[PDB]
Amino acid sequence: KQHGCTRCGKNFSSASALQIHERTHTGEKPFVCNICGRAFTTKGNLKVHYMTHG
Amino acid sequence: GEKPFVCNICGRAFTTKGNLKVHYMTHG
DNA sequence: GCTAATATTTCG
DNA sequence: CGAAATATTAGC
Ligand SMILES: [Zn+2]
Ligand SMILES: [Zn+2]
Ligand SMILES: [Zn+2]
């Protein structure tokens, strides 16, 4: 099975990868910085953002 | 250290030989 | 620098 | 295995 974005057309390596990509269309950003409240689509991008505070 | 593989054209560093290789092609 | 997104690697 | 993490990239 290919995990394609039926609603945008891009293909992805896994279902969870499709998940992350779908957030670019829905605006879902489940990872919120506890210091300033900026929201991110991925855990990894929030992690990097925390290093801009310390 | 962290990124031992360095591109002698632009000076960017990379964690693996392979990552350097794919970047090095963009200068060709 | 700092974000948005994804390709590659790692993980349990 | 697919999820998760990580490295990288594009953009400004
Ligand atoms: Zn899409
Ligand atoms: Zn913050
Ligand atoms: Zn270079």
Would the Cβ of A42 be found within 7 angstroms of any atom in strand C? Answer: yes
For A8, counting Cβ atoms within 10 Å of its Cβ (0-12 exposed, 13-18 middle, 19+ buried), the class is exposed
Question: What is d(CA B1, CA A8) in angstroms, rounded to the nearest whole number?
Answer: 41
Determine the Cα angle at A33 with ends A36 and A42, to 5°.
140
Asked if residues A47 and A40 have their Cβ atoms less than 8 Å apart, the reply is no
C-alpha dist (Å) from residue B8 to A33, B21, B27:
38, 12, 11
Place domain A3-50 in its CATH homologous superfamily: Classic Zinc Finger (3.30.160.60)
Distance in Å, CA B5 to ligand 3 centroid: 11
Q: How was this structure determined?
A: X-ray
Q: Contact A22/A5 with Cβ under 8 angstroms?
A: yes
Answer yes or no: is B24 CB < 7 A from strand D.
no
**Nucleotides of strand C under 7 angstroms from a protein beta carbon:** 1-9
The DSSP H or E segment spanning A26 is: helix A15-26
Q: Which fold has domain B1-28?
A: Double Stranded RNA Binding Domain (3.30.160)
Would the Cβ of B7 be found within 7 angstroms of any atom in strand D?
no
CA distance A2 to A10: 10
Q: Which nucleotide is the nearest neighbour of A15, by CA and C1'?
A: D2
C-alpha to C-alpha distance for A2 and B14, rounded to whole angstroms:
31
Region class of B20: left (phi > 0), else alpha (psi between -120 and 50), else beta: alpha
**Count of C-beta atoms within a 10 Å radius of residue A41:** 19
